[PDB]
């Protein structure tokens, strides 16, 4: 349980990691010289938190050289690379040393909610919830740590040509405007996989369940829904379209509408999917066991949440077509448009630098190195490199209003930025109720979208309406609309 | 409604507008009462099923009637982000509109009599000014006087007090914007603004239209002007960077001198404070002065086209501190109101020597967010951020319990028909509400 | 209580107005007789509202006092502010 980390040992004033080691480590696949041989050479040492108190570290070998004023002059260890202090969801952030810390925390919490390809063998796994992105892309502005996180192989986003500008005001207060034409070409399009499982229990001769296409003349608990999609075995076939309130598994239980009741499994409301595959097998008890994975294509629409790698979260305010979106001197319309008001308060300069390095990487034909602590890459070098491709050194660009063609007085900032789509869609959150089911103990509405429950008119709401002096509304909500 | 329902405006009456997509679309000015942002927030909607309740909400809880709050006798909803930055850049003295653009803007006015005003410039080319259109936006014949965020204090005393060079000193007369640049001080949620005066002089319906007009017209003009933010607004000339680096180099040298004094016992404690407390106060003073000096230098280096300045002047979002942190220097990171503590044995991190009370060792982030933070400065900044997250995650329970206690103790207290304030027990708490029998909505600040 | 000396305010409160419009709208919705003209008014709310502006609503507001007494103020005797 003693948490520790490796560090480079340091002699009087020099490191022990000589060039002969890096040479052997380069040919690691040939001479089988790995990290173990490096540790055994006495070059690296595992130091724990309790030993760090007695250790004097050096952030980089530059600190070991002779300076005009000696700070320590008696170093004993050195850090391999300062970026290693970051975790997994924080290592994916480009230029995290250029953003407010809370933002990096909020991104570390959003990176886990971003869609992509969670695993390569997703067609075989029948998981209860899985979101797969149609066209994942590796980030143009990446950190040298992603090569180890395998983010290059299983990315979770798309590089979007984002423009930081106020266009019609539909992107205000942490919102974004998307390009409908891009969405039509599969921009951020994804699929939602949901797996439904069921089994027939033979607990006793008194009552036994069985999968079979139910029948009105013999079944008792049959809903108003049609069971024609169900096969004779009661299970449904792949490739069939299923909507909410439909049946996918026809199960019946023998009684003590005679001698048997319907115990079928219906789909969740507001799903409207297609059956991807159906599997049948035997559980531990040797009873028949079925799993049905429904597939539903989720097209990005108004209300879907998007987020970059810097805490810049927001919902799609509106979707404008390519004719209505702004454009540069050349036919480059922004895939996404964000409100500049989200930058000053949050101070996410990394978003701007990423948007710059992405434009340079795309025009140069490389992948931007956004390692956090790298003195070899700053905003001036990126600006100079961008001026060589015929673009403004600060990333700005003249845009033309898509509705009237007139130039925009303020040269807008535009460039490629890696955005991510979050599992928090609006179709999974939209809820309504009007004289639905109620609980048993108290004849009040249910709880949850899954049960067609009602919203909670809590105490805080009662207090608010008391302040308004609205006695009739407060009465209708607590008595006539809840449990008369 | 939106949860947590803090104040009475967190549940307002709205008129339905049916549209295709599956989201609750709100006006942007009505997002401030609910404290709602569009980063995935969810808000409930209750539909009354009776004409009594429908009329009750239509006369007691509608949005127009809830603009001004008795909590602080000032409007709670005001102009917002884009409409406030653009209205700032629209009412300037150098904003001229052609006949085509004006006709495009006037088309978005509901309270327009259909008569185009004589332009402020008839030759050599007919040109209208932003204030000339805003005068049509302002309803009735209200009168107001405010001051822009950049209004200097040595102007109302000397000459040009009534003819401002910087176009400050907002003056509305007979419903016409005679002069001045509008911002949060004139259109925001402050007391005595053009909105508050519109709700007092004019009715609530007129103020409703005033809100809609500002949003529509200003957004349609911003569609022409445009607003953005980028690296060009966060960069400063080499002179400014040299002045900043010199200022910080001097601050670090002064702190080194303070450390040498205390180490040689050449520093005496102040009355009522310990030697350590005196040393830390002096160091904190030196660093705070350096942060303020560098911040002022960055603010002086910003051009009139800079978008950061355009955000802070109108007050739409941000402050001068944010600019100072993005351009010049982030500053000292504080944990529990004090510098970074010695988590290790007499050290903040194993990279520093023992007993190093210097600025870089105790958490002075001498770099800006644009130049990039060093590893240590990044870790310390993470500490400074984490304390904010912890407070934001802990205060919710204590404050919510306080809100509940306060309501349950005063939920039945009401103004009876004899103008006195009584509780459920019929006992008397105040012979007249607020000792004067007046409601907190119509009152406002004045001068004796 | 002596109707010759009513101490309550002569103006109609926002709550009294709300309940008056609500109850009168309900009455109109139940096909009750209308007092004023209905040139283009059908929605019971708009009808009750025009009736208030016209001051032709046949309702009496019984303002209860803390002591237990009450004062019956008719909709025509109260001064409408909004």
């Amino acid at each position: 349980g003693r948490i520790c980390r490796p560090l480079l040992i340091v002699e009087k004033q020099k490191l022990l990691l000589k060039k002969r080691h890096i040479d052997q480590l380069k040919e690691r696949e040939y001479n089988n010289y790995s990290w173990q041989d490096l540790v055994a050479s006495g070059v690296v040492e595992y130091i724990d938190t309790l030993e760090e108190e007695t250790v004097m570290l050096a952030m980089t070998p530059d600190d070991l050289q002779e300076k005009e004023v000696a700070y320590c002059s008696t170093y004993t260890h050195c850090e391999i690379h300062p970026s290693m202090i970051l975790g997994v969801c924080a290592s994916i952030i480009p230029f995290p040393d250029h953003n407010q810390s809370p933002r990096n925390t909020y991104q570390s919490a959003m990176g886990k909610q971003a869609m992509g390809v969670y695993i390569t063998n997703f067609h075989v796994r029948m998981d209860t919830l899985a979101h797969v992105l149609y066209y994942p892309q590796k980030p143009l502005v990446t950190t040298r740590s992603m090569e180890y996180l395998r983010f290059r192989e299983l990315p979770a986003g798309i590089n979007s040509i984002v423009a930081i500008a106020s266009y019609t005001g539909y992107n205000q207060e942490d919102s974004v405007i998307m390009n409908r034409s891009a969405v039509d070409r599969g921009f951020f399009r994804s699929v939602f996989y949901r797996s439904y499982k069921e089994q027939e229990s033979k607990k006793g001769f008194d009552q036994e369940e069985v999968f079979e296409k139910p029948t009105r003349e013999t079944c008792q608990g049959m809903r108003h829904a049609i069971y024609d999609k169900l096969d004779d075995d009661g299970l449904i076939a792949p490739g069939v379209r299923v909507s909410g309130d439909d049946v996918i598994i026809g199960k019946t239980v023998t009684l003590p509408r005679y001698t048997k009741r319907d115990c079928s499994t219906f789909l969740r409301t507001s799903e409207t999917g297609i059956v991807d595959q159906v599997m049948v097998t035997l559980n531990q008890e040797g009873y028949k066991f079925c799993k049905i994975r429904v597939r539903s294509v989720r097209i990005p629409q108004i209300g879907d949440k998007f987020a970059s790698r810097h805490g810049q979260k927001g919902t799609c305010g509106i979707q404008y077509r390519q004719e209505d979106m702004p454009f540069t001197c050349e036919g480059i319309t922004p895939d996404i448009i964000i409100n500049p008001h989200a930058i000053p308060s949050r101070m996410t300069i990394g978003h701007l630098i990423e948007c710059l390095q992405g434009k340079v990487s795309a025009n140069k034909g490389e992948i931007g190195d956004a390692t956090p602590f790298n003195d070899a890459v700053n905003v001036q070098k990126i600006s100079n490199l961008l001026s060589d491709y015929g673009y403004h050194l600060r990333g700005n660009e003249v845009l033309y209003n898509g509705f009237t063609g007139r130039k925009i007085t303020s040269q807008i900032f535009i460039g490629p930025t890696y955005y991510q789509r979050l599992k928090h869609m609006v179709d999974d959150k939209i809820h309504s109720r009007a004289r639905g089911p109620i609980q048993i103990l108290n004849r009040q509405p249910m709880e949850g979208r899954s049960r067609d429950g009602g919203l909670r008119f809590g105490e805080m709401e009662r207090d608010c309406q008391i302040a308004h002096g609205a006695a009739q509304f407060l009465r209708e909500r607590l008595f006539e609309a809840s449990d008369p | 409604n939106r949860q947590p329902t803090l104040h009475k405006m967190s549940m307002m009456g709205h008129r339905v507008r049916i549209l295709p997509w599956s989201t609750f679309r709100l006006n942007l000015s009505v997002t401030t009462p609910y404290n709602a942002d569009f980063d995935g927030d969810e808000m409930n909607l209750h539909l009354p099923q009776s004409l009594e309740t429908r009329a009750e909400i239509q006369e007691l809880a509608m949005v127009p009637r809830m603009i001004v709050t008795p909590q602080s006798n000032r409007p709670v909803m005001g102009i917002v982000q884009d409409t406030l930055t653009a209205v700032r850049k629209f009412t300037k003295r150098d904003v001229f509109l052609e006949r085509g653009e004006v006709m495009n803007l006037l088309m978005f006015l509901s309270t327009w009599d259909g008569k185009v005003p004589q332009p402020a410039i008839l030759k050599p080319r007919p040109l209208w000014t932003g204030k000339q259109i805003f005068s049509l936006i302002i309803p009735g014949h209200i009168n107001c006087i405010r001051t822009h965020s950049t209004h200097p204090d040595d102007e109302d005393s000397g000459p040009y007090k009534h003819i401002s060079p910087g176009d400050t000193k907002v003056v509305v007369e007979n419903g016409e914007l005679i002069m001045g640049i509008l911002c949060k001080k004139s259109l925001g949620t402050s007391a005595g603004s053009l909105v508050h005066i519109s709700y007092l002089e004019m009715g609530h319906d007129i103020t409703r239209l005033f809100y809609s007009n500002i949003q529509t017209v200003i957004n349609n003009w911003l569609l022409i002007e445009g607003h953005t933010i980028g690296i060009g607004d966060s960069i400063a000339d080499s002179k400014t960077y040299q002045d900043i680096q010199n200022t910080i180099k001097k601050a670090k040298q002064d702190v080194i001198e303070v450390i040498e004094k205390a180490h040689n016992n050449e520093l005496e404690p102040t009355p009522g404070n310990t030697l350590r407390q005196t040393f830390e106060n002096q160091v904190n003073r030196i660093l705070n002065d350096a942060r303020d000096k560098t911040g002022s230098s960055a603010q002086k280096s910003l051009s009139e086209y800079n978008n950061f300045k355009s955000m802070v002047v109108s007050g739409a979002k941000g402050s001068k501190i944010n600019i100072s942190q993005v351009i010049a220097v982030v500053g000292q990171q504080n944990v529990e109101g004090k510098r970074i503590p010695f988590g290790f044995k007499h050290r903040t991190l194993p990279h520093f020597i023992k007993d190093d009370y210097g600025p870089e060792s105790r958490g002075f982030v001498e770099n800006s967010y644009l130049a990039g933070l060093t590893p240590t400065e990044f870790f310390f900044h993470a500490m400074g951020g984490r304390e904010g997250l912890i407070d934001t995650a802990v205060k919710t329970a204590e404050t919510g319990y306080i809100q509940r206690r306060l309501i349950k103790s005063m939920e039945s207290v009401m103004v009876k028909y004899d103008a006195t304030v009584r509780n459920s027990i019929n006992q008397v708490v105040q012979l007249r509400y607020g000792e004067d029998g007046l409601a907190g909505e119509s009152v406002e600040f004045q001068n004796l | 209580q002596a109707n010759q000396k009513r101490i309550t305010t002569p103006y109609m409160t926002k709550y009294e107005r709300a309940r008056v419009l609500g109850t009168r709208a309900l009455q109109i919705a139940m096909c009750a007789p209308v007092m004023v003209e209905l040139e283009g008014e059908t929605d019971p709310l708009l009808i009750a509202m025009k009736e208030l502006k016209a001051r032709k609503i046949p309702i009496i507001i019984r303002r209860y006092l803390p002591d237990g007494s009450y004062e019956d103020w008719g909709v025509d005797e109260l001064i409408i502010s909004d």
Partner: peptide
């Protein structure tokens, strides 16, 4: 108000602090 709310009655608050009576002297359509 908490008591009348628990009983689902018109709480003596705002619109509940008074009662409305019909005026037969004015009901003259």
């Amino acid at each position: 108000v908490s008591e009348n709310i628990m009983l689902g009655q018109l709480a003596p608050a705002g619109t509940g602090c008074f009662d409305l009576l019909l005026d037969a002297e004015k009901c003259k359509y």
